[PDB]
RNA sequence: CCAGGGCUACACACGUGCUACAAUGGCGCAUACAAAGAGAAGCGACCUCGCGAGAGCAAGCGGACCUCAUAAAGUGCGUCGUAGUCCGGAUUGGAGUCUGCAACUCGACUCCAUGAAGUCGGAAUCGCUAGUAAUCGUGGAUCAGAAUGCCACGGUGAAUAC
RNA sequence: UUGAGCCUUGAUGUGUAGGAUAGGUGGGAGGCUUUGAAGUGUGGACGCCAGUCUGCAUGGAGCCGACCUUGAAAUACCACC
RNA sequence: CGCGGGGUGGAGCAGCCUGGUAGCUCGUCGGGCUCAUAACCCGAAGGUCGUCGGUUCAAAUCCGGCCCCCGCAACCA
RNA sequence: GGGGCUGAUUCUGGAUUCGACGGGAUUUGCGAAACCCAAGGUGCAUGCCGAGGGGCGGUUGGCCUCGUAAAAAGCCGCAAAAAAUAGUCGC
């Protein structure tokens, strides 16, 4: 059922059943399954309530959803209030990491509504 | 072409069973070269259909063949003053193949599972003509014997 | 309809490819004398620097006089209240020696001057001729065609 | 002649590519099969360590012996059950790798996190009739490092031409 | 001739049940049959073509009514028509 | 002023009557169709019948109304 | 010269140029102009005199600068400012 940060699954592959919150994908759940000792394709009815509630903990270990949405925030608050190169790209829609802007980085603009 | 009047390609017989019509639907379904991965599912379409129709594996599709088989397309031989289609009788060779191009092509529509299960169930309605092959087939019909005869 | 005077001679000498519904900014003496007060569209193009299309063709002039004080020219580059979409893709396919924005037709849509505006591209004589014989080649065919059944 | 920047700028158009939009598939496990090649101020095993990219250690090789180099599709099993999902991976943050004096502009990347656009492409258009289209890999040139481009090779394998 | 008017007369009308081309209302269980029957060959009528109306003669001498499923009931017989 | 009828899919016309078991096509979209469109072919959609009551086993039907479109001779305050 | 008519499809009230453009406002990222607090850094500097200002001259009524006087930056005319700045047709 519900774990710590949202983390409400239907009857999934419990690994693909951690995919459902921000801050961690299948492999690091996995690690995060790791100790949890249960299987990876058991469904959310097949979750037993001994090992639902010990779930909370290993999702805890990790820093997650709950306050990973803002840690984007303050490295932008490195770049976009600090005046950084990254930043100007970041400000205006630009690709930071160096695509060819002349063509391509289309994504990085947003669609193609112009 | 112009004067290439070359034969065709030699059909090989199946490799569970000498025909040329269960051959070819392996070498219809071929994707990326994949022939050994195309042989399993045409194989499962009709052993799960003499599963279903309480049929033999030859059997099962010779007589499906025929509700699927035309017998006068409009091929679109237009000079270009008139949009005209004026009808031509289908090759024998042809007669059976443009029936073995509908069908394949019908599996690929309404994809649900997987194409061993979606080509069984184009071919029994086939059939019995109850399919979208009858719908191809007649939608064929419509245009051919409303432009019966041209010169 | 509300269909005013069209440059139907353009599509003999350009062969446009895509068309536009972008309306037209009209001064008060201008709207009067649109519904009726001859107004004219041959040679209609565009003046674009940033973002400033203009209907450069279009005489169209007062019919009764509202003209007072201050200068009013019959012959003017009217300003196209174009979309934004629209406008950025004109630095790119208007610029290419041949290539230009003329308006085919002007209309109204419920008492507004939209005017339909398109691509042109510009034939050369030597394709014209091919044209004005393709259009007969056509009618000529079904001709030779029908004679089979005479 | 020098150091830094620029040729990597982008509200935009066009050409050519790779990637898909999946269940003939994706994922996980098991498992079998080639040639083109290239190498010494280079190829670099094996082993050790690192989740790994790689590092430490280091044999053989200027070569039918040594190395790059584990072939993939295929097959079998498990798993997924028609969704933009376990598709696609763009964009993007953090941590590392190698190249080289140096990687901010601006490299390839690896690990983790993010998860999009895109659900089959109008009008129009090309390619080819065979080991072809198609697909999956592999090497090489260039190169300190750095290609979805270029060249070369291998595997599977059509359809139709009245 | 052409229509209308009315006399005489057959034809003439299966929501749904249902064997029924049963109209309504209604008096009614014996009508009727060899002063040639059930039911024939069918003609034509016919029609929501369901199946009746149905000449003649063979057939030759029985059939239907309350009776039965029906909202209802029986042209077994009729009266207003 | 009181005489003649009909009002029904978005549209124009029928079934009603000789009761019960609402359609047609025009305009629409669905497809075919196609160097391209279209000719043309079919697929689908729509009002409980102008409204309100009564009779009737049975009302779109029939009858009472009411309303609307009108047509009409009236028209000497 | 006088009278009548018409004066953006509504011809008696409910204009909504589907648009960059001109304008305001809101949310949002926060900047001595979108700000102040001497506090964190932080000891010898600031202001007026003198003082020259890129290539030329000047230049903010005030500046990158000057420990008592000739060099260094933004900017103004000068100067690397471009052109069939839609088509199409000609000698």
């Not at chain 2, 569970?16 to 045409?42: H, P, Q, Y």
């Not at chain 2, 000079?79 to 009808?87: A, D, H, K, L």
Request: aromatic letters at 6%.
């Amino acid at each position: 059922a519900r774990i710590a940060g949202i983390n409400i699954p239907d009857h999934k592959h419990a690994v693909i059943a951690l995919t459902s919150i921000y801050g961690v994908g299948k492999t690091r759940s996995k690690a995060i399954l790791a100790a949890a000792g249960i299987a990876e394709d058991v469904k959310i009815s097949e979750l037993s309530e001994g090992q639902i509630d010990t779930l909370r903990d290993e999702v805890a270990k990790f820093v997650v959803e709950g306050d990973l949405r803002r840690e984007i925030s303050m490295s932008i608050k490195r770049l976009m209030d600090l005046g950084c190169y990254r930043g100007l790209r970041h400000r205006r829609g630009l690709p930071v990491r160096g695509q060819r802007t002349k063509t391509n980085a289309r994504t990085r603009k947003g669609p193609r509504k112009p | 072409p112009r004067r290439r009047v070359i034969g065709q390609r030699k059909i090989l017989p199946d490799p569970k069973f000498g025909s040329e019509l269960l051959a070819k639907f392996v070498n219809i379904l071929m994707v990326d070269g994949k022939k050994s991965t195309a042989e399993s599912i045409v194989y499962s379409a009709l052993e799960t259909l003499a599963q279903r129709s309480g049929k033999s594996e030859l059997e099962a599709f010779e007589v499906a063949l025929e509700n699927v088989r035309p017998t006068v397309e409009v091929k679109s031989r237009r000079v270009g003053g008139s949009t005209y289609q004026v009808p031509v009788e289908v090759r024998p060779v042809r007669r059976n193949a443009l029936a073995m191009r509908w069908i394949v092509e019908a599996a690929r529509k309404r994809g649900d599972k997987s194409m061993a299960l979606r080509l069984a169930n184009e071919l029994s309605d086939a059939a019995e003509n109850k399919g979208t092959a009858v719908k191809k087939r007649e939608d064929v019909h419509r245009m051919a014997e409303a432009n019966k005869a041209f010169a | 309809s509300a269909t005013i005077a069209l440059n139907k001679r353009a599509r003999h000498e350009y062969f446009i490819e895509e068309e536009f519904e972008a309306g037209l900014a009209l001064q008060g003496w201008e709207v009067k004398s649109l519904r009726a007060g001859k107004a004219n569209i041959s040679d209609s193009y565009v003046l674009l620097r940033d973002g400033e299309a203009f209907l450069f063709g279009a005489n169209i002039t007062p019919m009764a006089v509202a003209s007072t004080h201050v200068v009013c020219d019959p012959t003017r580059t009217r300003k196209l209240l174009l979309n934004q979409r629209e406008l950025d893709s004109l630095y790119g396919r208007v610029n290419r020696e041949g290539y230009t924005v003329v308006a085919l037709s002007l209309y109204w849509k419920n008492a507004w001057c939209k005017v339909k505006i398109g691509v042109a591209k510009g034939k050369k004589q030597h394709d014209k001729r091919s044209d004005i014989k393709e259009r007969e080649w056509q009618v000529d065919k079904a001709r030779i065609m029908k004679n089979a059944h005479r």
